[PDB]
Design an enzyme around this catalytic site. Sequence first.
Site, PDB file in Angstrom:
ATOM      1  N   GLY A  10       0.852  -1.199   0.000  1.00 46.89           N
ATOM      2  CA  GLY A  10       0.000   0.000   0.000  1.00 46.89           C
ATOM      3  C   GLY A  10       0.873   1.229   0.000  1.00 46.89           C
ATOM      4  CB  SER A 140      -2.890   1.228   6.674  1.00 50.02           C
ATOM      5  OG  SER A 140      -4.233   1.682   6.739  1.00 50.02           O
ATOM      6  N   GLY A 143      -7.745   0.266   4.735  1.00 47.26           N
ATOM      7  CA  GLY A 143      -7.359   0.683   3.374  1.00 47.26           C
ATOM      8  C   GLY A 143      -7.866  -0.275   2.314  1.00 47.26           C
ATOM      9  N   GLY A 144      -7.835   0.136   1.053  1.00 52.32           N
ATOM     10  CA  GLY A 144      -8.303  -0.721  -0.051  1.00 52.32           C
ATOM     11  C   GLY A 144      -7.213  -1.668  -0.517  1.00 52.32           C
ATOM     12  CD  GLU A 254      14.209 -15.506  22.172  1.00 54.32           C
ATOM     13  OE1 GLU A 254      14.154 -14.869  23.244  1.00 54.32           O
ATOM     14  OE2 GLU A 254      15.253 -15.614  21.495  1.00 54.32           O
TER      15      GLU A 254
END
Lengths: 441, 429, 366
Positions: A10, A140, A143-144, A254
């Site tokens: 993105g 994000s 978002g698209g 871990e």
Amino acid sequence: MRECISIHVGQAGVQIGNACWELYCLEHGIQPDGQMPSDKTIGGGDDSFNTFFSETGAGKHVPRAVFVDLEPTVIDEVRTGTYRQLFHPEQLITGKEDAANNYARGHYTIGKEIIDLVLDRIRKLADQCTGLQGFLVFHSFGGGTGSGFTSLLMERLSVDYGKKSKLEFSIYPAPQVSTAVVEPYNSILTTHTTLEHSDCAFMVDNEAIYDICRRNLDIERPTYTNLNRLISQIVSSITASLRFDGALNVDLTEFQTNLVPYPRIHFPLATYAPVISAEKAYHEQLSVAEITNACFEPANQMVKCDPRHGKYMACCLLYRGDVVPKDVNAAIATIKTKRSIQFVDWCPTGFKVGINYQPPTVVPGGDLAKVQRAVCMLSNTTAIAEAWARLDHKFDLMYAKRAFVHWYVGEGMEEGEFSEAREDMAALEKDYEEVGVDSVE
Amino acid sequence: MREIVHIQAGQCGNQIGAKFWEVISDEHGIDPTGSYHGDSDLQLERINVYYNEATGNKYVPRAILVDLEPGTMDSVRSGPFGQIFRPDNFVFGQSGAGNNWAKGHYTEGAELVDSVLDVVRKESESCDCLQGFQLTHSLGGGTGSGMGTLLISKIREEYPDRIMNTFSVMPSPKVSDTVVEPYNATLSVHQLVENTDETYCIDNEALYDICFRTLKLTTPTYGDLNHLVSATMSGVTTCLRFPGQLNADLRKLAVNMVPFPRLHFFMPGFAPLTSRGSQQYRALTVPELTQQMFDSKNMMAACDPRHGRYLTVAAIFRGRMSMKEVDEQMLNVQNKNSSYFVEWIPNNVKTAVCDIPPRGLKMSATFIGNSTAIQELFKRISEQFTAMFRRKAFLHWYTGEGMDEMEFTEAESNMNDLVSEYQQYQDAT
Amino acid sequence: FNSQVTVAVRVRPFSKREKTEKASQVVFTNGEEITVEHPDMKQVYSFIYDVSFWSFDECHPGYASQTTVYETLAAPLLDRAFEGYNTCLFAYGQTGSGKSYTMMGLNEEPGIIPRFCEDLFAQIAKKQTSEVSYHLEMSFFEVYNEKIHDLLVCKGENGQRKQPLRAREHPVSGPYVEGLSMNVVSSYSDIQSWLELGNKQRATAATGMNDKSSRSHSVFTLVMTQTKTEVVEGEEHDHRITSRINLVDLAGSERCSTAHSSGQRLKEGVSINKSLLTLGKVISALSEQANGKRVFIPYRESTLTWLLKESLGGNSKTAMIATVSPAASNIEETLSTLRYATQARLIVNIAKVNEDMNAKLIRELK
Ligand SMILES: CC(=O)O[C@H]1C(=O)[C@@]2(C)[C@H]([C@H](OC(=O)c3ccccc3)[C@]3(O)C[C@H](OC(=O)[C@H](O)[C@@H](NC(=O)c4ccccc4)c4ccccc4)C(C)=C1C3(C)C)[C@]1(OC(C)=O)CO[C@@H]1C[C@@H]2O
Ligand SMILES: Nc1nc2c(ncn2[C@@H]2O[C@H](COP(=O)(O)OP(=O)(O)OP(=O)(O)O)[C@@H](O)[C@H]2O)c(=O)[nH]1
Ligand SMILES: Nc1ncnc2c1ncn2[C@@H]1O[C@H](COP(=O)(O)OP(=O)(O)NP(=O)(O)O)[C@@H](O)[C@H]1O
Ligand SMILES: Nc1nc2c(ncn2[C@@H]2O[C@H](COP(=O)(O)OP(=O)(O)O)[C@@H](O)[C@H]2O)c(=O)[nH]1
Ligand SMILES: [Mg+2]
Ligand SMILES: [Mg+2]
């Protein structure tokens, strides 16, 4: 060795990756052209490590990263930017068009003809790994492209490799600040899948880091060119255990086995000590004892989530610079000493610790001043469910009248798919209640 | 001569090994290259105890390193004494367990344990008279524990007549490192108690208080705590390599210390420490050493004896001393503080004396204790365990490697049983 | 049922060995009371038992065969098994004291084990009705150097086919062996065939004390379940009981001074003595418990005890049989054995019947 892959999908991640690789190269004395005049002067040191960077015969070094956003007007900045002679030119600008806040394009319509190459060049990257692997996917939510694409990728990756840690540093949607109207649709639809494939999705918000940038950093007028760096440092503070030495170093796995009680609750937070400006760079000792209090302060949280409305399940702290272990032990004790900080009964252990020697570096053009030490904190708590609540409610209203949906259907997504995520996310919220409730006998 | 195989497994052990040999080399006049530059044959008469020899009057240690999942590998090698170690003995794999015991016992360590075991066989066969094994590790973690107990068991099957000793950093009461120590350790203890002749239970917290108050150090590091652990490791075997009026050895330590085969966990101590200033403000005597020796704050195990009692101890002294004052002093302790000791053991203490002091001390001592206080640590790990087990708090990570509920359950029953056993003799009669 | 253990004793007579090297008599049976004369003729020790037999001679009253001893000792345990009680019998004593000769016996005079087994099969024949359906299974295994091996397995073909097994503790039913090939019983004939195979493959060997010694510990388990009608107008056959019988052939001290040997021999002897010692400590603390003493029981100090936990104590109607010699050559051994036994009478466990009304409502209605 250990290897780790950086993927930026993105815009939001790519803009960050610019911030990340800038720090990495700087922290390792590497020049933008991949050259090492510092190694020329030294004649030694493995600094240009295989953790993040490959190396050729010419002494040039190349980072283990790709990216794609279906938006050429961004990646091209890098193809023209100062780091253009760094990256491998097989960065995947297929951006004939953008997903435009529509999940379905990135997942179904135009996720085709793109993802085929993402996986390919990835395979080529893994084939250079003679060691650990682990995936850093930067996107994000809401978002698209940062979702409809990243849903596919993790799914495919859970198949091709599967038995590898798949980490994500991701922007959560804020409660108030939004740059779209479809974040809730776009977000919830994502969680239906990445819940099953991933193992640890580190989340952040822009509202929080904004307020943070005002208070402690004394910054009136921030932008992405100040936010990303903080998000970059955090990523370093994690991964630095791989590149440098330390008394208590940690790998990526871990984290996975210590923060994640049950498979489906892998949604933690983060903080730091960016309480720094050139002016307030003085007048404080920046002890291990100070910061640890700060690392549980509600204000310095990087998402808009009151911990005090929930309890802590498990936590991990990663220190840098001149740090004394004993001082950590006293400090952590203090943190249990305080009564506001309610843990689950489950985990008297509660805490993990990791420590490195290599202090933070500073980027010129920057704001956060020099120090001798710093820490990163991660945390899994129940308080976030309230934030999950917000998104389910926002969804509920503007889904009921099926607003905006003909768009998503217009790309072929069936109505019921929305509800499927909803029932899931409700059940997910229910899980936080079950576990949060105290045990009995 | 009696010969020992030392093994390093886990971030905490290897550093202890790292600090260890740096002390032994100093106790034997050896350089980072492995050459001799000492001034006494005594540093050489029994060098074959720990080391092998090589061509040009060099001396290679009998050390083995198995969890060099590489991140600590360079740390060892690019060190002031990294170079002496046999490069071939640097065994390792990759893809660290992430503290998951099962990975450290069932999957990854399974692939590697053959190779390390093969190398052990070489160092064994090259010996003239093998006595026992000396492992460094920690509980609570994945590698040090799982791969440890694995390697411990196999060796026991191959050398069941022989001795297997460990020095195992234990999980704390309060200040954790990992969050699944109750899980990681109890599994270990299940295999530790059953495949061991003795182990030395060490806690970080006590070492902190120890270095904090008596040594009066405000900035101690992992590098310095170890420096105390290596001392005890060397004191236990001072009477092995060096002579004295009254000699001791590992086998002589157990049989006087292990009345019942399962109560083979111990609380060590070491004297003397004085933070350099007070050095001008005392003098070293046998009662003086004894006083620190049974000091409730010099116990590196963090199990306050005074809520329990001792079964049997071993007070290995080192230097020029008179035995009258030695034997007298133990009796006084047996007398005045008798309630902390068992009736049905008529003498609750042994002794051992070596006539060779250390580098810069006129007289030193080493403490070894077996007591009922160890119950407390064991309860903690059990209580922490159950609170997590019943909810299956973190369980799914191990089950993904093939463990099942019974196994976690088994160890629990065993651990509680060990407690009850101690509790049997906890009450005075 | 907080109840005690039946302790029985059998003084076998002397042998060719004593005939060759004269060894006088010192054990004497006052019908059933045991009395032992010190060869110094300074003391007579005497011991009282719930049961006695005087196999020293065939003639004087007190004499008993294998099946006399059975109907004294083991048929009552058959009774309690059909009552539904788990049951135990285990042997004790030195080498050449007929401990196998009693429990298992040979072909021509088989032991309590085969007598009980045929009695059990025919006792099922007595009630082979639709009133109660019966289902019997059995296992048979051995203990050698703390390693567990399966007696009922035809070994493969290899230089080393003694496949070890390991133990696991069910949180409820207690210990058990992995891969233990418990097999179905149709009859005592099948039991016999199984026992023949196992005793053949048992790791036994000739030595200087006997021509063939039980150098390994043997366990012989049966479990009989019996599904009976309940007291309801609906599904009647929803009641069941189980009963677990455990017959144990142990090993003897085999003091090396007379059992001059080397290598693997001494190894097996060492392991044996260690095991038996652990058992003795278990027995002693059990006696103290029966005296009301709050005591920790080191079941876990070995394998034998761990597996036999629910039989040495737990919930079962149990017994021990102690084998002793008349020859003064081994008077010390016989005395130790007698003291073991006379202490052993004092032991109790809490014995009930294993209905296992799990997912049944029957016990809840009860
Ligand atoms: C050198 C000198 O004259 O000063 C002393 C000294 O100041 C004192 C305080 C030393 C010093 O101890 C420490 O400073 C210290 C600091 C952090 C952690 C642990 C120790 C000393 O370092 C410790 C050192 O002891 C030894 O030299 C032995 O070799 C000891 N190990 C080492 O110190 C050592 C480490 C690396 C390389 C070479 C030696 C040892 C321990 C066990 C078995 C054999 C040897 C000694 C006498 C001193 C110094 C050097 C100041 C003391 O320890 C010993 C073993 O002597 C601390 O209390 C004793 C009393 C000593 O007087
Ligand atoms: N923290 C941070 N967030 C960013 C940055 N750039 C964009 N974003 C966020 O990205 C979101 C906009 O949706 P994105 O997922 O970026 O859109 P995309 O990834 O370009 O894909 P499209 O949705 O098709 O544009 C907003 O919530 C922004 O806050 C950045 O530099 N830093
Ligand atoms: N009371 C007895 N009357 C007649 N024959 C006996 C009697 N007791 C033992 N025997 C026989 O004498 C032999 C000696 O007994 P033996 O079987 O060697 O003891 P054991 O049970 O084998 N001891 P161990 O080998 O240590 O388990 C056996 O083969 C019996 O047949
Ligand atoms: N004394 C000492 N303890 C250490 C050191 N480094 C780590 N530890 C301890 O060892 C534990 C970490 O376990 P570790 O063996 O690294 O896990 P594993 O190696 O993955 O099995 C923590 O509890 C630490 O406190 C050291 O240098 N000295
Ligand atoms: Mg976009
Ligand atoms: Mg026999």
